[PDB]
Design a protein around this ligand. Structure first.
Ligand SMILES: *[C@@H]1O[C@H](CO)[C@@H](O)[C@H](O)[C@H]1NC(C)=O
Ligand SMILES: *[C@@H]1O[C@H](CO)[C@@H](O)[C@H](O)[C@H]1NC(C)=O
Ligand SMILES: *[C@@H]1O[C@H](CO)[C@@H](O)[C@H](O)[C@H]1NC(C)=O
Ligand SMILES: *[C@@H]1O[C@H](CO)[C@@H](O)[C@H](O)[C@H]1NC(C)=O
Ligand SMILES: *[C@@H]1O[C@H](CO)[C@@H](O)[C@H](O)[C@H]1NC(C)=O
Ligand SMILES: *[C@@H]1O[C@H](CO)[C@@H](O)[C@H](O)[C@H]1NC(C)=O
Ligand SMILES: [Mn+2]
Ligand SMILES: [Mn+2]
Ligand SMILES: [Mn+2]
Ligand SMILES: [Mn+2]
Ligand SMILES: [Mn+2]
Ligand SMILES: [Mn+2]
Lengths: 201, 201, 201, 201, 201, 201
């Protein structure tokens, strides 16, 4: 997991000209102010009018620099009815979350050794779920109303590997011959899938 | 922080006769069932009719054995008007939280090297705070209504060191001459404070 | 990464009745024998007559119990001409590898913050590649001959999340409405893809 | 615990104008000299004429920059007769110590899960004690003569949270209404306690 | 470094029949007693009438089971005049030490990247030294009186690799042709050196 | 082990004027290029005409800057007939390797607690070995032809402590009186050994 802190506070210096290190260099304490341990960025619902039908409002170290070195971060996800936060992976964190409003099918997938078992249930207000580091998982709004959840991670920068978008719309895309062999379907089907992710989102 | 996991899942075997190790031994996967990644324990408010005027509903590994090895846990805290979750420390985790309802003064205290500086603000619905591992902190309900928050930790078992309860109601209590020297007051004041925590809570 | 060792040696006790812990309990040293630090399991090529056109011969802790607690493991992958080791993720390890024979296209994909960039090149005998923990990656045999590679991980049990198999052949499968929303195609296309992975491999 | 080192030596560059990171940037080896692995700062007794009746002579990374990245530090504590090193916490390290001269009552307090149990004994010359990371603990000189101890930590910068001083004399102090609720006594008692710590030490 | 603890206390169960794990299984708290955080084993000087002319009194987890999971241990080393604690390595810990009596030459050796540089000085009462994890180091009594030091490690079980004993008195010994090639001397010189360590100490 | 990464990529900035930190500062991604995850430095055999009769071709972070933060590295070792990679230690990594050509005696030595036990066998093409962090080990070419192996480490910078060279040819060398006491032979023998390593290699 994230390296442990070596002092009380180390607010990320996010200036583009700052020297680059594992994580982020820190602001001198004299420039950190009094409010760095606090945020209000998650008070408002994200706009769910996206191809997925969900919106992620991130509160990683880039959005909450006071989390730098502390080994944690958060985000909020809002869902239109029938919207999905599609199969995805966090390369560097386990996730722990609570549904705040609505009804969300939450699915978590074991690795090959676990027989690729799918664990899932419809999670409602006040109910929680946990997703081990690096495993594929998703959420899907099964209700008629807008739903949302708030989640936390044991990393300042968990990362997100969106499976459909990286499989079909990476920069540049994976060669079609690789995907026809891997997906066991003809080039026409692979190209149809590529066509849906051509815009980079 | 918590040791990283060495497999996908390892549900804590909480049987009193189980061999003891750092953390917990695990249930065989055949006996884990399908629901271990999920909990509903935080759906209901805790009873705030306590001396503190708050109630902690824990979702550590003891209450959510599916978190075993995963490096995370949660809890919920409810507050009566004027209620406090008193100055306390988590010995083994950073805390990251969101106020869900009401108005909570949240205070976070730096160590000696940070000049014992107090960082505080009134945190309202949807707003968040972060508490570095091992630092003293508190919450206080400054509103007229009941308030609650939901918090996460980067440990399955963060621990709680309540400052007033530990100082005055440890088992056995700290000798009075130690406390008179440390607190710079007469024995009468120390014995008064001890009398308020004589039940171990 | 994997927890550090707390003694010189701790050979995994792989008996089905052994108590379960994070990782594995260990054989008493009296029963470990003299050969546990050594293996010959990767001397022979795997059978590439598979749908993928590749074969993985694993040398994780299950196959090499002497690696228990040591923070490392290996495997070998053999490829038929035109064969793929399909897009996949290791949830708990960085991978570092060398191509031993043939010509392999090796592709490594950044996360969302890296713009889902695809880094790739054709890697030949004696040439090497490195794959950060949790990132999607693949290999494809672009040569006319059989190819093979030998790779190492900074975990005793890196895990493997095969993207096509997990998306379409999980147990149970991900519901079709989740996949139609995520993949931006009709149910017919999703059910076609499911049919190709219906045997769980 | 502290992040592991990534090279042999990395002497802290403690210049006030140096870029800030988790821990400290390092001096080039050409500027480190030949003596960085050694210190003589603990050869002399600290002056015990302080309100606590003890003096801490620190040998953390700020005083011994050669410890940077190495995951260890030390200090010496001297005690007047009847003097205390008051209830305190190290947020980022376990402590391991030896009494060198005199008779010191050493007390270590479990967390809530341990029933806030107090473990204690009078520790004499050559005898040792260990204090788990983040737990409240104290020392008290029960002898008629000056006493001292030398302790080590598994961090370059363990930190110190002095319980009485941060509870009553933080910058700014915790609001009195918070403390009356938490300590279960009247405002007059809280103000008396505050008055003893008003100077910041 | 050592895995972090997942609870307050976990006293090593050192029974020969206990299940084996990374580190040690733990005594139930009901059986731990009240004294596990304390030791008196280092109060007395070791017998320096040895070939080395020094004696190590160990306080690792085997001798102080209360250190289990806590990431620390200690030992004491006593020296006859002209005695050595010979060139050695700790495979799993940084060492931090203080000379308590006498005059000890302490030498610390950089790795190949550090040009195998030897850092050394004569360390006297109250003076300290630090040895990075895995590096070769030694002590030698240059005084006319008996000397002793007390050292701490950031591991419960640092391990000791004695260079002369391992090179010449391993069980079984390293083959003579390996040592003649490595040491650049004839078989006669190697067999002479082997003869000095033929008892395994 | 090496601190975990806090982002996808962080290519080492190896400019001599760069600020120094634990590990290495990183190049901005705009300057990293497209090829940093790949190397061809191990395609060619090293020249085995050295006193040891072996050559190490390193692929640590200094030679493969793309490994920075990723917790892995590699090297290749080539052996003349009768050549040795002499008893040595990696202070910061376990090693996992495969013999590619020839016949190599591979020896691994336990610490004092393991009775300084020597584990060894002749390892041939495709066969593997594992060496726990910090333990002394060697390889010796028992065949009539040139042999080679390729190994990986769970560190970007494992380090190398060559036992004969640091014992006898450090900068400056260990004083002869220390070595006569430690090795249990006369000064003449110690000086003969020193004479073989006087050139610093
Ligand atoms: C999202 O924002 C767009 C652009 O402002 C707007 O047209 C749309 O109605 C919004 N959707 C929702 C669900 O609020
Ligand atoms: C809350 O606790 C108080 C005091 O113990 C008790 O009188 C009351 O019955 C409790 N309320 C509920 C709803 O159980
Ligand atoms: C390889 O696998 C195929 C398909 O299962 C099988 O027909 C063939 O016998 C296998 N080859 C060997 C050498 O076992
Ligand atoms: C400590 O120092 C002060 C100021 O120099 C001095 O007056 C006092 O006597 C000293 N106390 C002791 C115990 O040495
Ligand atoms: C110290 O060891 C020597 C050699 O084994 C022995 O003769 C002597 O009795 C020992 N001294 C004590 C005090 O036990
Ligand atoms: C190694 O290189 C040297 C110098 O170029 C050469 O003389 C020697 O023959 C080479 N040895 C081998 C075994 O290639
Ligand atoms: Mn997620
Ligand atoms: Mn808290
Ligand atoms: Mn892979
Ligand atoms: Mn302390
Ligand atoms: Mn040592
Ligand atoms: Mn090696």
């Amino acid at each position: 997991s994230d390296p442990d802190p070596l002092q009380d506070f180390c607010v990320a210096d996010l200036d583009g000209k700052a020297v680059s290190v594992n994580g982020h260099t820190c602001k001198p304490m004299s420039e950190a102010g009094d409010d760095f341990l606090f945020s209000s960025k998650l008070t408002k619902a994200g706009n769910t009018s996206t191809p997925n039908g969900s919106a992620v409002t991130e509160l990683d170290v880039a959005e909450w620099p006071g989390t730098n070195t502390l080994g944690v971060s958060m985000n909020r996800v809002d869902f239109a009815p029938g919207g999905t936060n599609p199969p995805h992976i966090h390369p560097r964190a386990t996730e722990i979350g609570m549904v705040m409003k609505g009804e969300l099918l939450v699915g978590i997938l074991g690795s090959l050794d676990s027989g690729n078992k799918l664990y899932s249930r419809v999670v409602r207000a006040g109910e929680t779920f946990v997703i081990p580091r690096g495993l594929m998982h998703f959420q899907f709004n099964v209700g008629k109303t807008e739903a949302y959840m708030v989640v936390s991670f044991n990393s300042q920068n968990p990362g997100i590997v969106f499976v459909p978008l990286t499989l079909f719309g990476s920069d540049p895309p994976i060669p079609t011959p690789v995907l026809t062999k891997a997906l066991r379907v003809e080039a026409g089907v692979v190209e149809l899938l590529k066509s849906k992710f051509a815009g980079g989102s």
